[PDB]
Amino acid sequence: NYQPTPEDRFTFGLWTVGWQGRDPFGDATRRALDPVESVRRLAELGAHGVTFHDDDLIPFGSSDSEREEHVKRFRQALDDTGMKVPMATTNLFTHPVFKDGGFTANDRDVRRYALRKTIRNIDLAVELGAETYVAWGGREGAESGGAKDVRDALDRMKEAFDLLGEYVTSQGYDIRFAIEPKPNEPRGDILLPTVGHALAFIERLERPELYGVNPEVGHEQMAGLNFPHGIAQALWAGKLFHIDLNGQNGIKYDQDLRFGAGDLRAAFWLVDLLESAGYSGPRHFDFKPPRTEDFDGVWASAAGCMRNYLILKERAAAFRADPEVQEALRASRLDELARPTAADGLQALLDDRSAFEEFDVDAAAARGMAFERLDQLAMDHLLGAR
């Protein structure tokens, strides 16, 4: 009954089930969880692995000695459970030093510090077997117009990512980077606010092949955009390196609900696309169990993330395999969208009278697209009402 196994590739950040519940208006409602306990509990629920920021695993300001100890305990829990660590990232947002950003802070000394803190964590990530390193520039941006010259800030962001690519290349590491967009919060406006802006930026880096995107469901929804459409553009460009799955109720603060909550129809269309395109990376959940819950509620919320992905996978698969759906797709001319407009070439098109001079515009205009019938078949499949 929709039971996950390690083969489903479900992963969770330590900071997700570990969120203590502090919000802008309230204190923590839960005690801190030791990373070793989260690894054990997630493994029991059927997860494949975990991810971390540097500061989630090793407390900020730890001595080299303390650092080694934290790593050793963690590595033991991974060995004990068979859990993997497919991705890691850096915290460049919590400490006060990063109040104006890491890579794009106005202060040059802070920008050099941000790069060194990042490089230290890349080494660790490689040691633990991570294949992807995420960068979320949560403090890169502004609340007022004069505070940041965006052209100069993009020069600084490019400079930072180029240096990181030179580092991994020089070291011979087998790791790629994934930039995660967000439109706002905590800054009034954040740089590279959507998947489009991040894809465009990557094309100006020195070694574009090393970088892709890590889109998050609720971030594109904070700009009112269609998440499945954004993922289709990332897949088309060959840059979907990783993904963050969760839920969000429209344009408001970043909610990070469990996957399946928020926009359920968009969750269905997202699973349909990931499974049809054969995405083979981790299915990572970046969510927060609400602060109303105790520890029992935390694990119920984490289990619900995986259950909803499995129900949606079954329903999308039943939709695509139904002969009545296959017929409706041809009725709506999805087969014709997939054929070239003019494989015959420019000259042939220019010489074709059926394309203009003798094209019957009124007859073509009267043809219904039959999209409502197709969408109701999709609704019936989602609801298990066939």
Next chain:
Amino acid sequence: NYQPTPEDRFTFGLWTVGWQGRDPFGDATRRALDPVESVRRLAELGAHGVTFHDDDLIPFGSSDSEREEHVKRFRQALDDTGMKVPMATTNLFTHPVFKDGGFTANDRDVRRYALRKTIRNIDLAVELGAETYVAWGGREGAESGGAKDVRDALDRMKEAFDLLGEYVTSQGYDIRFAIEPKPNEPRGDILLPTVGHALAFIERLERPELYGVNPEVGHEQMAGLNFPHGIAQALWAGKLFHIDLNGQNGIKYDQDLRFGAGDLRAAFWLVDLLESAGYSGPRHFDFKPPRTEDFDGVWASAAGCMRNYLILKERAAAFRADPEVQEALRASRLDELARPTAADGLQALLDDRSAFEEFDVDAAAARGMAFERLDQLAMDHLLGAR
């Protein structure tokens, strides 16, 4: 007193002052304007030129004879006034045949028709001296998830733009293309919804040098994004080929208010950036005088567009030239944002103990950015309260 002249490069679409006032819930409140009359009235107000869709100038379905007549009258009005035509575009959205799109309609025959209608208008545009040809794919998108496979639609969009580039190259024309994003309306979701998504798409075309963006103030604001930030990214990429100026009150239907209405502070920061970066293209207004107005109100609204740009230009210039502002910019370390993080190189950075091992994080964190004082200087300059 803020009087425009042709040297200010202010331009208007025929469809702007020519909007009859039909909305989703109401009939037209104004009679149609002849294009010749709009050219004469705009020239009297101090505009530099006009732009058009094919269908604004030559009524859809016109015979070759009628076509020649419409063009001749128009060319006479331009000669009589000294007005120029710096940009043109195609209507691929009004006729019912385009109900599912032009370049990405599911029906192949419609896609071939859309290309031929476009090519016919490129020839005309060149004849009239246009330097830029805009493409707004207002019907490219969907209301439901199964109706459009986005990967296949992006293949079709790329195919169309590649054919257009082959056409202009083969003809030896001196014209470039500018894609105009919009997130929604009239389709539920439109493809290439923001400037970021359009910039990323251009990088996959066969001759990327031929294509840039035509951002519009109110479109990026329909996704809650910061317009000046989006323009800074387009300038950084070298792709700001043209711009549409107007006003919008937040996330709602596309209002197309006169420039200066809507978000006034964002209008100030936009003018500051265009003038500092030395943008030298047209200052084009894509607006609609509200349907509450008669013809006197139409021309007052058009004049207000140009007046507000001129007031904002004066205030931004006074801001940048004030010694007290120059001092506040250094207080907030804008000068340091413009210097390279590590011109010394990767190895030097790795060997620099002042960047990590001996960096005083607490001292750097305590330094205030002085952004509020800078922003209040900007407020005082905008309001003429210095």
Next chain:
Amino acid sequence: NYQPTPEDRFTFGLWTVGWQGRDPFGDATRRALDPVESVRRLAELGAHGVTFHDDDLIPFGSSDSEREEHVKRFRQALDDTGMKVPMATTNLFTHPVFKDGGFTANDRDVRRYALRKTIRNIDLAVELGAETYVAWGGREGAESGGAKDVRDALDRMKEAFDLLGEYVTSQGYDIRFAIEPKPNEPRGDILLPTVGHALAFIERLERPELYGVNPEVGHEQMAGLNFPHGIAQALWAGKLFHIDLNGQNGIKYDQDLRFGAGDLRAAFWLVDLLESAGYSGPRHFDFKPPRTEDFDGVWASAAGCMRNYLILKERAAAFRADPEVQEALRASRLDELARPTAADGLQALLDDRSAFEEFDVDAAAARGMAFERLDQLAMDHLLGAR
């Protein structure tokens, strides 16, 4: 298999299935439907009745003779099918005369005209057996701040509704009014923008008992609000006189999708509430079949409205009847929310040491609410995954 019957009380506006597909950027894609044909087709699908604006039934500017003829044909179709007319309303938005509003236009003569046009239609509505008369003030509002003094406009709106109440009272009619809010579109801002603002306004009318609200799903969603919460407040006040059901994808133009599309989880919670509270009015659909469809698509979309309500009714009923859900509701203390806080009275509360002096705040704070488990039970029931 989810087949509607007249007993389900499903109703449709003539303007819904009759929408020709004209949008702000495009011409009509469908021919006009005769009202008699819509009555017959809806009756075959299992609807209970239809509603109309004056102008949908009798073309604007019709002579008394033509008026009688249109009514007679309509009455014949109702008799032939057994369809009823439970609600009617007035068009005070399409004609150019209403460009600044009907009841709150600045011009006094227009305000008197709007009242007379309304009264003429109340008489007709009563003749046809309507129990509710809706008022949607789509043109009451503004695009700019100086154009409308809102205090004076609310005086004018109150004056209009008071006169309407005096009219129905004097005539001895058995009809009540329902005001329908909308936040924007077609005006930049519309007066009484949400259900809250309309409920508050009703309390200042001379005979408040005669007026309630007609909320619409997508209108409250255009302000990012929770529709089921707004309906619960209207039910609490005893003012849910009628409802408009449809779908909307977030904050954007008014989409009017078929019911069940848009926010599916909010559709589930809405049906749960209407059925639990025993709402007994019509289940009216105010939707537009997308302009991509032909007539076959129109009727498929209308049938889908009713099907989705019936599937959701079954799932909400299965949720409330499940013993495991009843247990989870007690686990989350929904039973305690329904008990008075202090039936003992103020003095007893003040004297109760267990309420303050000896209340163990830490013990109460540690109690989890178990909301995630409850919400996953609701997800499983919606998906038919129990």
Next chain:
Amino acid sequence: NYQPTPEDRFTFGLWTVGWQGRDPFGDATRRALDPVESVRRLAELGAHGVTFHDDDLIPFGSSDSEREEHVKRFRQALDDTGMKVPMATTNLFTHPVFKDGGFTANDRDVRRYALRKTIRNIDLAVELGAETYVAWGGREGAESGGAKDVRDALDRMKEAFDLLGEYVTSQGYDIRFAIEPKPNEPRGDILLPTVGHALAFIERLERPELYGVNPEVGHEQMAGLNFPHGIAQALWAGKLFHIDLNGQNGIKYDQDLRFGAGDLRAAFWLVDLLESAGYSGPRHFDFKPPRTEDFDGVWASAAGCMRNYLILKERAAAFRADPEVQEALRASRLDELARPTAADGLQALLDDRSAFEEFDVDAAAARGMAFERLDQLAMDHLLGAR
């Protein structure tokens, strides 16, 4: 030069300039300020008074002894400076016990606790001379649909406010309540989300005369609504008891920028209305100096709040006094909006042929409203460009 004095009635919450800068993603960037220091610094800048939550003044869990000491020091600073305390409120949101709400928590014991904590603070407020007591129910709401039955929660909210009214009446206090709406954050949806919903709720309380609203600029803007329109409805109902002034950039997290930032045109129209209507309550700022600033930046931000109100007051006054504006108001028929539609009565209206039978609809429709010219006069006055 726009220097405030105590006579301008400018007030600030202790929590405003006292915000340490902790956000959902970061630690505090400033040290805590002693309330005595904030009183002294605000008095030097020209403020009239301060406001507080119970927990801002007396640390949660303080003994009666400690409580008396905190109050005494505060009262000394007020006496030393001449500052007043016009409003106070309760913190029912920070402590973990309030995770599901105060007045509407599902747990009955928590609801009784919330009432006692509130009553204790009403006594203190009266002692300090407050005239208004604000209630912001920031935790009253939900993240999921089954967690809260809204009808039962509104019964509980009414019960709480009724008990509070019985308390003040029994004690003979001269204090009134003001409910402050917010649509979301920290809960997914908050109950009474806008000024409309709060006004409607007040009408169902036992002694409605004791309660009004405390609207906040950025809260109504989080729902995309027009703030000046909402304030006009509150003034029309006679319920504008207090106001919170700040700035917000559209639909996103609650920014609490300084007043004048965010939507500057809406700030202009708000000042115009408060000054024209003769609002005589405090001009209270509920803002947060951004976490990028040090203490110098905090006081610059607070001073900017008052400066911007004074500049806007001057510009709105110059607008209303300009003869050319007075003429444009008559051109747009604002004078006619203020006259009754039908002082003649219902029968006279029904008998008036000029209102229907002989009304020339086409002539009335052709009359332009001249709103664009009026709005450009308002723009010129705001910018000091007359």
